[PDB]
């Protein structure tokens, strides 16, 4: 017959790499905020495969896109030209007022493609010597699990044993302009690279006017304003980019994860001409970068954040949960921060008693969560969500938190 | 209306990173071994997506298994567990022969994964003092566009202009036993890189024995083998892997590209329990590695190649299309080479006369191919072709070629 | 009676080592361009002895330096002084411009004492930590045949089965600006060692503006330019030093072979005093280093090259062979190379057809060349021949290559 | 005018590397045992060139020879064959009782070829791993200034800012049978090189049954001795080698200087077939090596000693120049050494009064001799002295000493 929760755990544990330790439950099916297991059990989804799936499991309008490209085209590679590239460039850099942008698959790939484009721009353009350009980082930053990506991480479980590292790549606090402005001092600092909330680290939002002052500086200094959006963008904290919130300009924007709804590994990097044309033909690209099949589901999932306006929605109800979650013991409940449906909470770990054993309990009272260290846990259901079902969710939280 | 070809190119122009210099050819359908272009023109396709599409575009097969999954589930990232992942992992490491596998998502993750499993062995099996480990790589080597993968090049196109480098890589000749066996001399390297036959750097064949001299080397100093088979395998060049024409065993085999038949971006890397498990939970991850959706469309990739027999009919046909190309003559073509239907003409380039020139006229007489320099021309069909269309396509690069 | 040619080959065959295997060909006479053999028969001598006879074989005016010094003092070793040194030192470093010479013996010698000066500059006047210093080298490089030349060689028949190697070596490609940039990143690095013109590897002449690169990237980064020019420097290539043709100074010059004229073994390693004083006294040597004898015979060697303007014949000269050798058939003769008069052909080799028959068949029409390779042919007369003497050889050339 | 004997050493200083420290006396002219500096002033060698005048300077034989061919032909190189060189190879080898010899020209040349043998034999027939032969030599040793060379000194200003330096040279002290047996119990040692007397250490003679106790150990635990000859060899000691006293045939057997008389660089390699043939054409060689002039004089030099019985005279005149020695004053002169005409004296050097000082009051008194450190002067004049002659210059001797 079909496998258990059990059965499906083992299975992996035999003839699967052991890099994940997942939470215990084993999903068959996916529909806007729900997800299902073998045993027909329905959870809440509050990770949202870390904002993949912001317009809900399977949204019907980007698997229709999806099962109509793919009775025709699906990888032509970039050797040759198909129709449905160049329709999604104009879209997305329309979108986002960008003059161009660089096709991706994953997340790493976006930041890969923007260390490349700060260093050749670098030495292209600002004029550093080869190969003397740095590219500065903010410590508990996450973009990826490359040799490049590891090598700017200040997470020994990111970098341990996995050395050498690559040169060239600095790192100061998040959160700290004084510092940014002490590293901008070094004329062959070609670029910084922060996300405008850090998601891996734990749902770490900087001060307000943060990124108001990084643009500043970086303007100054001859800097490219690298924003990694792929985590906080598309809606997910409450605006199309939550660099929004400032009215701030990155140089350059990473997007991936929501960008396809789940469907497919689709990710962009979007900036202007005098940064984007330093790579040229021949010097950059990937198999199925900008492939046709992802092209029509990335469509797809940009225009259902516009057309339902999600970003509102996800502002409207994350007050609500913010709210809702402060009202929990401080001597339980650490701390509540986020913007939007981007949310975590601290709770007051002790030896006996963590973030873990907790989601554990969410699990077995309906609702899926992952816990970001022994004391985060982190709260981001789909944006497709109502304000009864958040509620009933926040019971879930509620009865669990308490419950111990 | 419709875009023309001319609107196609111009609007990529426009919106889209200038990362390639495509052949000026834009298609809108594929099926099986052929293309159409906007203009309702049909031609051959003799790139095969960088051997994405061994299977012929748009595999019914692989095409239903995806509308299937896409219906039920997509993501649910690797947070959680999904019914589809494990019933992969043990399909994929049966066929292959090793314990596990470790999901990824394009072909230069795979290879970032291998390097770091080879460090992480290294330093924590082989005992390397930490972090003095280094990974030996053959001139011409591609194994992708991070930073780590430019590092390793002997390219200028992939590196100039994208430094710092990553330290820790060794370079030597390729097909050269006695360079290989002086580089491993040094006890601080854990594994050697290669790819049994070069693709972008020309379809290099190395000579017969060259594969089991590596493995013999490896085996004798306490080396990792890490075969790249991303291009190479999945019965491109007539076998399930390059290396079964030597009947070798690698300790690391990387899988991409037609893993997925094109329709989806799945990578793997192959080992066996003592390399796999150096990496322990938390350590290594994508977002979509292992995603439900990547893996339905593996599984029934891997199952075409299988039923068809398509390595079988890359072997019979390969001869045939070689002995053909020899024909020309020997003053316009300079040599021909490959292995299964992985191949490659050299032509005598004039400053008047190229490559690129060539391939313009192939397409105006129905045929698409791609240069590898001024003087290469690959020849890689999808490898569910017939003898009947192969000898069609063959005359078309005999009146092609001739035409000059 | 004498020795008959096929019994001094069996004499050697019996009583010497066999670590040559020379073309069939007992020579027992040379004059100027000429050579015979015990037979009586007369050759061109289309190789000069790799240069060392560009003044022609035994030339008076050297000869006569050999016997007038013979029988005044040949040998005091440098426990005392000679009275001949000091003037051959102030000779050729005003020739050259440099403040100092080293005088050595051997082409590896001058090598070896280049690597050397170039380490003590590293650490002494560089910084670099004892004994971390590098240099780098091309693939392709000749130096000789020491433990330390060997250790940087590309070919297998130079290092297989004579290790463990020299560390502190680092190959990179030839006529690559971009990978020599690389490899200069590290600051242990205080060297490259380069020949302008690759004669072993086969004539290799690289780009245009590669020297000039090579100067400019060894100044921007603090390290030594080492130009060996022991076969294409004193007027073989047109000029006094290969690196003539494009302006550039390197930091250490090593001069050799045409040094003597063939009549003893003389080299020297030209350098300023900033490098030249990094070595003391006592700290380096040769037993037959600056002997009396080799000096004056050098002095000789250098005014026939200045009066008789060698390097202008050369010059002209060289462009006839080249003008007149491209005239053969592509088929058969694939490519001509080279400047001055150190030139090469690469013919078209058949498994039937190759280098050693085609120098066979040279020999047997009155014409001496080795061939470097299954399909080279170098090409380079003593630098004394005359117009008619060169077109009478290029008739010899086209007979015999024509005559297959 | 003609440049003074202050002249000569300023030209040297300002356009010559100071690698060295000459006494000061410049010589033009040597015959026999005589040097004459441009003063005109009369001297005794008793350095005779580190044994390459052992025949005195410029011996009419041997210049004879280098006249007579000088006139014929001086260098075809090793692309083709010389009617000379197998004349002198039968000459040599059956001279020495060795199947073949392999011509080279300085003396670490020879000692390079010897290295390069025993790791090819090492590999190909004891069967050792590549590459992890070892080759053992003697505290004390020296062999030369190539980089390879000074990797097994002991002497810190042969090494000291020259580095890195060649693996696999170990080093044990010089006349110690246990520390030699003590090496040699591991299979990975290819060879022991060893000079049968040390030059350069200070003319150092091993305890008697030394040499036979190498030869011993050596063939007990099958591994090459190599005996450095070079300067001991060719009737120096008062035989034709210094390993004749104890009827021990090495592995392989070096010489040189001598081999020449001082005319020309030229040394050889001797060892049998199964040794010798390790090492393929192609494999190994040198520009000049074996060049018909250069083997024209050492048949000379070598029919010269031969002839003039020059070993037994050496023998004769030791004996009497060492019982002459003894009588000065043990307080003043602490040793005296050496066998046949290689001797030296040990004084009781204080801070006022060195080997220098000594050497230079010498000179003053028409003996030229070198120092070799602050206490030991050497004693070796050509073979080619008289009883009176002797007397004459061991007069000199007492006289410099006993006058401070
Ligand atoms: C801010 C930001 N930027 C880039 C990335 C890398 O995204 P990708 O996984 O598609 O390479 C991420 C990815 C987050 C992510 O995948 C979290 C967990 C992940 N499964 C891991 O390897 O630990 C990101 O949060
Ligand atoms: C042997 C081998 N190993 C890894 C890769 C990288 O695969 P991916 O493109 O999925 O990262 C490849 C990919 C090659 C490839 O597609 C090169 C051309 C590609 N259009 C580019 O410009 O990057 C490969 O040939
Ligand atoms: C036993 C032995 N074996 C080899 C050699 C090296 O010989 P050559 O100098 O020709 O490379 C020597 C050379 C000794 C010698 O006098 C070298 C002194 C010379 N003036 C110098 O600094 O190199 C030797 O004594
Ligand atoms: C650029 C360059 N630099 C140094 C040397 C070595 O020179 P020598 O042979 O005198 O050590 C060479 C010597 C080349 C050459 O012809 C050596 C051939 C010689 N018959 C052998 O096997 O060693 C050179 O080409």
Redesign the interface.
């Known amino acids: 017959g079909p496998?258990t929760?059990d059965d499906?755990?083992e299975?992996?544990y035999?003839?699967?790499?052991?890099?994940?330790?997942?939470?215990?439950?084993?999903?068959?099916?996916?529909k806007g905020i729900y997800?299902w297991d073998?045993e027909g059990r329905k959870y809440f989804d509050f990770?949202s495969?870390?904002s993949?799936?912001n317009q809900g499991?399977?949204h019907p309008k980007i698997?229709n896109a999806?099962?109509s490209q793919?009775?025709?085209?699906?990888?032509?590679?970039?050797?040759?030209?198909?129709?449905v590239?160049?329709?999604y460039?104009?879209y997305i850099?329309k979108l986002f007022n960008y003059?161009?942008?660089?096709?991706m698959?994953?997340?790493?790939?976006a930041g890969?493609?923007a260390?490349?484009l700060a260093?050749?721009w670098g030495?292209?353009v600002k004029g550093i010597?080869?190969?003397?350009?740095k590219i500065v980082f903010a410590a508990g930053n996450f973009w990826?699990?490359?040799?490049?990506a590891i090598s700017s991480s200040t997470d020994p479980?990111?970098y341990?044993?996995?050395?050498?590292?690559?040169?060239?790549f600095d790192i100061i606090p998040y959160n700290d302009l004084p510092a940014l402005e002490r590293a901008l001092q070094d004329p062959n600092v070609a670029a910084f690279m922060v996300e405008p909330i850090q998601g891996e680290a734990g749902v770490v939002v900087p001060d307000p006017g943060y990124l108001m002052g990084v643009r500043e500086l970086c303007t100054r200094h001859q800097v490219l304003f690298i924003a990694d959006e792929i985590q906080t963008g598309l809606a997910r904290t409450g605006r199309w980019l939550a660099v929004d919130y400032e009215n701030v300009r990155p140089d350059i924007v990473l997007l991936?994860?929501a960008l396809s709804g789940?469907?497919?590994?689709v990710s962009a990097?979007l900036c202007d001409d005098d940064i984007?044309?330093?790579?040229?033909?021949?010097?950059?690209?990937?198999?199925?970068g900008?492939?046709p099949?992802g092209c029509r589901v990335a469509i797809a999932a940009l225009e259902v954040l516009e057309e339902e306006n999600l970003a509102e929605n996800a502002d409207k109800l994350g007050i609500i949960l913010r709210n809702e979650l402060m009202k929990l013991p401080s001597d339980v409940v650490t701390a509540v921060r986020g913007k939007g449906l981007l949310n975590a909470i601290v709770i007051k770990e002790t030896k006996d008693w963590d973030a873990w054993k907790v989601c554990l309990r969410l699990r077995d009272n309906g609702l899926?969560a992952?816990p970001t260290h022994g004391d985060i846990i982190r709260f981001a259901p789909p944006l497709v969500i109502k304000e009864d079902e958040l509620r009933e969710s926040i019971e879930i939280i509620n009865k669990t938190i308490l419950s111990f």
Chains 1, 2, 3, 4 share one sequence.
């Not at 003059?99 to 096709?103: A, F, I």
């Not at 010597?129 to 350009?133: D, L, P, R, T, V």
């Not at 990826?144 to 490049?148: A, M, Q």
């Not at 789940?262 to 590994?265: A, D, E, F, S």
Request: proline share 7%.
């Open positions: 496998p929760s499906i755990f299975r992996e035999k003839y699967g790499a052991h890099n994940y330790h997942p939470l215990p439950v084993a999903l068959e099916r996916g997800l073998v990770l495969s870390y993949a799936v499991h399977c698997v999806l099962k793919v009775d025709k085209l699906t990888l032509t590679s970039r050797a040759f030209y198909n129709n590239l160049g329709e460039e104009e850099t003059h161009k942008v660089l096709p698959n994953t997340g790493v790939e890969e493609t260390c490349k260093r050749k030495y292209t010597q080869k190969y003397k350009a990826g699990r490359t040799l490049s479980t990111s341990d044993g996995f050395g050498p590292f690559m040169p060239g991936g994860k789940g469907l497919y590994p990097v984007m044309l330093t790579i040229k033909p021949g010097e950059h690209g990937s198999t199925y900008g492939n099949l899926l992952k």
